[PDB]
């Protein structure tokens, strides 16, 4: 980035070879990056507006009967309540334009409109990074709500929060959804493990959910080759096979002659779908870093609202992208600020899994989606 004050001398010419500097800046006055349109769409299909700044999830103990007798009376029964609770983070972000008095006298007004448009683009980049950090950064955070401190959570991360019991399954402490494949290329065994780590918490096809896998194309080019009972990477054997979606070309079909069932939908939420494995839809995600897959539940009784909460300020005067009048005013220097405030946390800690493809060791957060590593 270039930065600093805008000065006379940053105004390169009034015209060059009959073309005005004003008419060049006028091109950029309303442009929007096609990647920023995609990033905005991903935020929209992956977040919900937080109305309650804290969530409490209670449970009740339970008891059984006793064998009766002719004279005596039973032992007494009691039960007790307990709960977990979760909150959503909140943070403030700033940007500035600064000018000299000579610059504002001499510069084309189209450059100021182009600058405003680029700040309004940098906003959509920021929200996407902070939504993806909420999912991929496997570390707890704190928030204060009414001055009480609350834990803000990613997915299950090896911490002491025990998942709820489901279909008589009882989980321990140390439950974890940040998974390392244990091999240099993706297995069917890894895909099967990751999808079942979701489905053990509810989030099933009986609950009416769809699972989606978002991946970089380097992993899809392995997954498309998984055939039933055939060997794959790392000596794994595929317990299902990859069925290409209705729109993928016929010459990609395997050496088979009929399909038992029906081919997957060609498109989901306006993204192209490559096919499915183990009833998970596989989608090439343009933003996804190379060695990673995100598995996400959608649309059931559970997962009927999206994975990540967007917290915003309670007062409408502090919501949205806002312009602040600055504190160098009109001579010799001028400034103005843009501010955006929001934050992110996950309620459905079991509703997604992050799988990293590496041979050994613990999970790494993708550099592009670490907290503190930057702002896009």
């Amino acid at each position: 980035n270039q930065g600093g004050y805008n000065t006379a001398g940053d105004i390169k010419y009034k015209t060059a070879d009959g073309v005005s500097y004003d008419s060049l800046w006028n091109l950029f006055s309303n442009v929007t990056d096609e990647w920023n349109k995609h990033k905005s769409k991903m935020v929209q299909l992956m977040t919900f507006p937080v109305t309650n700044q804290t969530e409490k999830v209670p449970r009740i103990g339970q008891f059984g009967f006793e064998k009766a007798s002719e004279f005596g009376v039973p032992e007494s029964k009691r039960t007790e309540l307990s709960f977990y609770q979760l909150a959503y983070d909140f943070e403030d972000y700033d940007l500035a334009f600064r000018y000299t008095w000579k610059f504002l006298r001499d510069a084309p007004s189209s450059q100021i409109k182009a600058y405003h448009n680029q700040a309004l683009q940098a906003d959509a980049k920021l929200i996407h990074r902070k939504v993806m950090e909420a999912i991929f950064d496997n570390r707890e955070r704190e928030a204060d709500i009414e001055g009480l401190p609350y834990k803000v959570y990613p997915l299950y991360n090896g911490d002491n929060m025990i998942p709820p019991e489901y279909n008589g399954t009882t989980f321990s402490t140390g439950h974890n959804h940040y998974l390392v494949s244990g091999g240099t290329k993706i297995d069917s065994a890894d895909v099967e493990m990751a999808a079942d780590h979701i489905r053990e918490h509810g989030y099933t096809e009986e609950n009416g959910t769809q699972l989606i896998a978002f991946a970089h194309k380097a992993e899809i080019q392995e997954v498309r080759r998984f055939r039933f009972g055939q060997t794959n990477n790392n000596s794994a054997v595929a317990n299902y096979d990859f069925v290409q979606s209705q729109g993928e070309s016929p010459l990609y079909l395997p050496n088979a002659d009929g399909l038992l069932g029906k081919q997957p939908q060609s498109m989901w939420k306006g993204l192209r779908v490559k096919g499915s494995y183990d009833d998970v839809l596989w989608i090439e995600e343009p933003t996804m870093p190379a060695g990673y897959v995100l598995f996400l539940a959608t649309g059931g009784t559970l997962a009927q609202q999206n994975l990540v909460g967007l917290r915003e300020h309670e007062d409408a005067a502090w919501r949205g992208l806002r312009q602040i009048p600055g504190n160098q005013t009109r001579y010799p220097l001028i400034d103005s600020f843009y501010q955006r405030s929001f934050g992110t946390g996950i309620r459905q800690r079991g509703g997604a899994v992050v799988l990293q493809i590496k041979a050994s060791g613990t999970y790494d957060i993708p550099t592009k989606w670490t907290n503190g590593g930057g702002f896009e």
């Binding site: 009959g18 990647w35 070309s249 010459l251 079909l253 009929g258 038992l260 192209r272 090439e284």
Partner: protein, 53 residues
């Protein structure tokens, strides 16, 4: 009715299989937007040539 779909087969001349991707749809949509980043001008007929390679 039977639960089996019959797969399609080669018909003598086959359209070349090319992978559609979400990334390539973004690149195509960006390229047809970038196509507007042109100005009409006076030509060499302006007494200076500093814009020309």
């Amino acid at each position: 009715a039977k639960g089996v779909k019959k797969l399609p087969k080669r018909k003598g001349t086959n359209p070349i299989p090319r992978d559609k991707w979400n990334s390539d749809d973004i690149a195509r949509r960006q390229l047809e937007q970038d196509q507007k980043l042109h100005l009409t001008t006076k030509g060499p007929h302006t007494g200076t040539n500093d814009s020309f390679k």
